């Protein structure tokens, strides 16, 4: 199965500290926190239902997702460097139903 | 408009501490953490895009959502009593697009 | 009700990052930290009693409040561009008793 | 000069961590965050205009200030154990105009 | 490969709450805390190097491991029913070098 | 007796917080969490079988132990500034059988 | 040279938080605060002239120093396990002039 | 009775903050923290057994006690201006056995 990638308006955060708060995530986005679409940030659970270190956020456009990833990929949060990956909503929703993304 | 309530298999957490972690939310659910259906916990932003203190979680059934609310409603998390409300996925998704739930 | 606006010797900070401290605020003000009047800086709660991201500071004169706004408006603090608005003490005190400033 | 002390409806927090935020103060107060009066928390400057480590908050009653002090005095916040002292508004406003309290 | 099981003087804790501390583990064992053998408790990392929620403790005899498991298996720690499994030191050391126990 | 200290591929953490969890220790190590060699973190007990405040971790090489100690020695975790000391497996195993490690 | 140990009417506190106050120490001692003999608490500097976390207090008798150590040894102060060791005035004076005690 | 003052190689801090710490005292002394003699800082109790707000410290010389008092007397520490007096060890030991200066 190839999750569709035509519209990449989401970001995945990977490597979040176990102690990350919602404020830590919004401060890490900085000016990009106003470019979030919807009223939710998705904290991801792994295949055992446990904290993954991952989160997904839908942005207002693919270009805002691209610029957030450019600015924030490997940026510091609580002395960990957090990965930021531009992705599609299908990729996000595939992971939320238990899928594994191979694209990196 | 009132969102449908036929299938009440979700829970809303209200009054989370500002520094709540995903671990603190799963510990708060306790035995009901294994009854989460998807691989996501939704941290809710208000109409200014700021943290609301709410979260939504989809459960494996309406009975498990009822039992979680029965046990966890007004339980302590870091000295705040957190409310737990059994709700439908339509109510959750309405709030995630900016709606206000009048059922309480 | 529109609060008096004749003596604009205060500043409002808006859009402070979640991580903002009192040290961060004084460092952000730079040369204007010496123009602060009293021994307090007001951190503002919103209508629900939650953090707003706003602060108020009284300065020793309108001209120094003006200059703090002119030089610090939309300056960076920890990856947010913080708004700095010149205002009166009546405007500040109105907000501190739960009023809204319509003037921008 | 000894400021009036008959109505002790404020609390002084002393020894705040360098990284303290308004969210950290509200989480620290727990249930007592809802008993704050006004929409301000006062962060205190020392006589060289730098952070003192102190903050003052007015509460809705003298007994709620007593109860916040009883629960929170020397409670942990980050790397500090923060003192909480029940005091009057005259004691608070005396300190905010550069006064020293000689009561403990 | 089958790890030897002749001498089952260890216990595995599984499903520890995320807030569990070493003080919590010792308090949960109650009367059995004095039957711990060495000066160490092992907190287990999963196949990704991330927390598992498991721990291993070597006891002073198989009978004390059996009695500790009898008393403490599915006992409450901070709203989790924590699993307590009697096992051998070979089983414990096999898991610590990356092995998976098939015995439950 | 002095334990051998020729191969220094372990780290000792000293002065851990009372409330420390395994997730707090991994967050503290950050990038060096992937440099842990076995699947266990050893939490150390004193002669009364209560927590000593120490932990030991075997790393994949002496160079990774050195780098982790360089970065993390006296770094903050919760209420504490945790010491990180590069040591040998014999030093670690001497302490796990009740020895007092004099080298510092 | 080993300092004389015949009259053990002092206590050594060890593992204080470096931000420890005299009120912290008196409150920790509880009933034994009134068993202090001199009008002083001797806060100890380390070999670099920095805070050690140690203090010495001369008590009214060896009997009262023994009972203080029985009741207060490893009792909690601000999430530390504070050690209380019964010792002689010669041991105290030896440490104050830069000696190291080899009795524990 | 007046304790002797022939050798004034100590400092008395008076009017410490209620919650005075060793770290506050060393910071306040600035360069003079390295001119302390012995490994002790003496925090004083009043006649009720409670912290008095006084401390005594022996310095490496009378002139270093003079210089520490000159620099630090009425300097800020937290919310207080702390008094610093050059004094003798006899003054220190007199107060430690319950005397009033």
UniProtKB/Swiss-Prot annotation, chain H:
Induction: Down-regulated during the epithelial-to-mesenchymal transition (EMT).
Family: Belongs to the ESRP family.
Organism listed in the record: Homo sapiens
Localization, UniProt: Nucleus
Span within the parent record: 437 to 537 of 681
Tissue expression notes: Epithelial cell-specific.
Described function: mRNA splicing factor that regulates the formation of epithelial cell-specific isoforms. Specifically regulates the expression of FGFR2-IIIb, an epithelial cell-specific isoform of FGFR2. Also regulates the splicing of CD44, CTNND1, ENAH, 3 transcripts that undergo changes in splicing during the epithelial-to-mesenchymal transition (EMT). Acts by directly binding specific sequences in mRNAs. Binds the GU-rich sequence motifs in the ISE/ISS-3, a cis-element regulatory region present in the mRNA of FGFR2.
Domain RRM: 9-89
Protein known as: Epithelial splicing regulatory protein 1
Disease in which the protein is involved: Deafness, autosomal recessive, 109: A form of non-syndromic, sensorineural deafness characterized by bilateral, congenital, severe to profound hearing loss. Sensorineural deafness results from damage to the neural receptors of the inner ear, the nerve pathways to the brain, or the area of the brain that receives sound information. DFNB109 affected individuals additionally exhibit vestibular dysplasia, although they do not manifest problems with balance or movement.
Superkingdom classification of source: Eukaryota
């Amino acid at each position: 199965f190839v999750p569709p990638t035509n519209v990449r308006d989401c970001i995945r955060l990977r490597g979040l500290p176990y102690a990350a708060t919602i404020e830590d995530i919004l401060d890490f986005l900085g000016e990009f926190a106003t470019d979030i679409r919807t009223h939710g940030v998705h904290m991801v659970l792994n295949h055992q239902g446990r904290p993954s270190g991952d989160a997904f956020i839908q942005m207002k456009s693919a270009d805002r997702a691209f610029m957030a990833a450019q600015k924030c990929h490997k940026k510091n949060m609580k002395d960990r460097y957090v990965e930021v990956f531009q992705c599609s909503a299908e990729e996000m929703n595939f992971v939320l139903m238990g899928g594994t993304l191979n694209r990196n």
